[PDB]
Structure formats: structure tokens, C-alpha cells
Design an enzyme around this catalytic site. Structure first.
Site, PDB file in Angstrom:
ATOM      1  N   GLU A  97       0.820  -1.209   0.000  1.00 58.36           N
ATOM      2  CA  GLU A  97       0.000   0.000   0.000  1.00 58.36           C
ATOM      3  C   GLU A  97       0.856   1.262   0.000  1.00 58.36           C
ATOM      4  O   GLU A  97       0.540   2.233  -0.698  1.00 58.36           O
ATOM      5  CB  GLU A  97      -0.940   0.011   1.207  1.00 58.36           C
ATOM      6  CG  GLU A  97      -2.072  -1.009   1.144  1.00 58.36           C
ATOM      7  CD  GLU A  97      -3.159  -0.654   0.125  1.00 58.36           C
ATOM      8  OE1 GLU A  97      -3.122   0.458  -0.447  1.00 58.36           O
ATOM      9  OE2 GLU A  97      -4.034  -1.509  -0.120  1.00 58.36           O
ATOM     10  N   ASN A 109      -7.755   9.111  -5.441  1.00 57.99           N
ATOM     11  CA  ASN A 109      -8.645   8.182  -6.120  1.00 57.99           C
ATOM     12  C   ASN A 109      -9.455   8.904  -7.192  1.00 57.99           C
ATOM     13  O   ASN A 109      -9.578  10.133  -7.193  1.00 57.99           O
ATOM     14  CB  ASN A 109      -9.592   7.515  -5.123  1.00 57.99           C
ATOM     15  CG  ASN A 109      -8.861   6.806  -4.017  1.00 57.99           C
ATOM     16  OD1 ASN A 109      -7.906   6.071  -4.265  1.00 57.99           O
ATOM     17  ND2 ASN A 109      -9.304   7.016  -2.787  1.00 57.99           N
ATOM     18  N   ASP A 143     -12.608   9.168  -7.705  1.00 56.51           N
ATOM     19  CA  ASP A 143     -13.774   9.925  -7.263  1.00 56.51           C
ATOM     20  C   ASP A 143     -13.413  11.215  -6.533  1.00 56.51           C
ATOM     21  O   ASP A 143     -14.316  11.924  -6.077  1.00 56.51           O
ATOM     22  CB  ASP A 143     -14.669   9.047  -6.379  1.00 56.51           C
ATOM     23  CG  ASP A 143     -14.016   8.678  -5.052  1.00 56.51           C
ATOM     24  OD1 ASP A 143     -12.825   8.994  -4.843  1.00 56.51           O
ATOM     25  OD2 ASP A 143     -14.704   8.067  -4.211  1.00 56.51           O
ATOM     26  N   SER A 157     -11.572  11.331  -3.694  1.00 55.48           N
ATOM     27  CA  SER A 157     -11.088  11.040  -2.354  1.00 55.48           C
ATOM     28  C   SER A 157      -9.587  10.745  -2.400  1.00 55.48           C
ATOM     29  O   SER A 157      -8.987  10.610  -3.464  1.00 55.48           O
ATOM     30  CB  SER A 157     -11.856   9.867  -1.750  1.00 55.48           C
ATOM     31  OG  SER A 157     -11.661   8.687  -2.505  1.00 55.48           O
ATOM     32  N   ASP A 214      -6.209   8.599  -0.316  1.00 53.24           N
ATOM     33  CA  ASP A 214      -5.773   7.567   0.619  1.00 53.24           C
ATOM     34  C   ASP A 214      -4.548   8.069   1.370  1.00 53.24           C
ATOM     35  O   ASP A 214      -3.665   8.681   0.767  1.00 53.24           O
ATOM     36  CB  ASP A 214      -5.423   6.278  -0.120  1.00 53.24           C
ATOM     37  CG  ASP A 214      -6.554   5.776  -0.971  1.00 53.24           C
ATOM     38  OD1 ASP A 214      -7.721   5.924  -0.558  1.00 53.24           O
ATOM     39  OD2 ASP A 214      -6.271   5.244  -2.062  1.00 53.24           O
ATOM     40  N   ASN A 270      -8.872   5.682   3.317  1.00 52.36           N
ATOM     41  CA  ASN A 270      -9.575   6.520   2.347  1.00 52.36           C
ATOM     42  C   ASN A 270     -10.432   7.581   3.033  1.00 52.36           C
ATOM     43  O   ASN A 270     -11.203   7.272   3.949  1.00 52.36           O
ATOM     44  CB  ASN A 270     -10.456   5.615   1.477  1.00 52.36           C
ATOM     45  CG  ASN A 270     -10.935   6.274   0.207  1.00 52.36           C
ATOM     46  OD1 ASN A 270     -11.044   7.491   0.114  1.00 52.36           O
ATOM     47  ND2 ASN A 270     -11.252   5.452  -0.786  1.00 52.36           N
TER      48      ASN A 270
END
Ligand code: NA
Length: 129
Positions: A35, A46, A48, A50, A52, A59
């Protein structure tokens, strides 16, 4: 902070992640490796809108408030920047809520695609734990 492999394993164990909801420690170290490459300061956006955050790439769509994800939730009740700290407490405590939400560690796409079904105990081999 960029963690060493065994350093992170020891800190995750001390914070109670070893066999939490049945996931052995190697699963968590493997997830963190793919990750964030063990880097607490990692961020990724991301599609959309958002973002991380942190060593487990948590998120802002559901779990933290970063002030730029309108309409989202803050289920861990933290600012997302808290997840970038060298102190991993907030990341671990939020991860405990995520893994308990019904999907287990399948919530982490890197774990499903790179850790699930492999010999995850290899990630803690050699560590004094
Ligand atoms: Na949010």
C-alpha cells in the site's frame, strides 16, 4: 517515517494487530508494503476525488476528514493528516474499525491482489517478535 520491516512488525504487534479478526501479523506487514512501501507519509488520489493516507492508505471517502472530500464520512473521527504521523497509533486504530466492517482485509485492494493466498508469514521471517 519510512519503517523497517521488522520495526513495523513489532509496532503492529504491540498495538494488537497480530491475529486481529483472524489476520496474522504477516498479512498486515504485506498490506503495508504494497500500500505505502512502509512510508507513513504516502498519499494517493482516487478517481472519485477522495484520497488515501498513510501506511495503510486509508480513504477519506469513509474514514477520515481531509476537508476536500465533500459528501464523505469520517467514521474514524480523525483528520486524515493524523494518519501521516510517525506514530502509527491512529492508523492502527482506524484499520481495526475497517477490518471489522464485514469485508475483512479485502478492503485493501493491494492485500487482495498481492498478499491474499501467498505465504504472508514470509514478511516477518527473521524478526525478533
Ligand atoms: Na471523509
Amino acid at each position: 517515517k519510512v519503517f523497517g520491516r521488522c520495526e513495523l512488525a513489532a509496532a503492529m504487534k504491540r498495538h494488537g494487530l497480530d491475529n486481529y479478526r483472524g489476520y496474522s501479523l504477516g498479512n498486515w506487514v504485506c498490506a503495508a508494503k504494497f500500500e505505502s512501501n512502509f512510508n507513513t507519509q504516502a498519499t494517493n488520489r482516487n478517481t472519485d476525488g477522495s484520497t488515501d493516507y498513510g501506511i495503510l492508505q486509508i480513504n477519506s471517502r469513509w474514514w477520515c476528514n481531509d476537508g476536500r472530500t465533500p459528501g464523505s464520512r469520517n467514521l474514524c473521527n480523525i483528520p486524515c493528516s493524523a494518519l501521516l504521523s510517525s506514530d502509527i497509533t491512529a492508523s492502527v486504530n482506524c484499520a481495526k474499525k475497517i477490518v471489522s466492517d464485514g469485508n475483512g482485509m479485502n478492503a485493501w485492494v493491494a492485500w487482495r491482489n498481492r498478499c491474499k493466498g501467498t505465504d504472508v508469514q514470509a514478511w516477518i521471517r527473521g524478526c525478533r517478535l
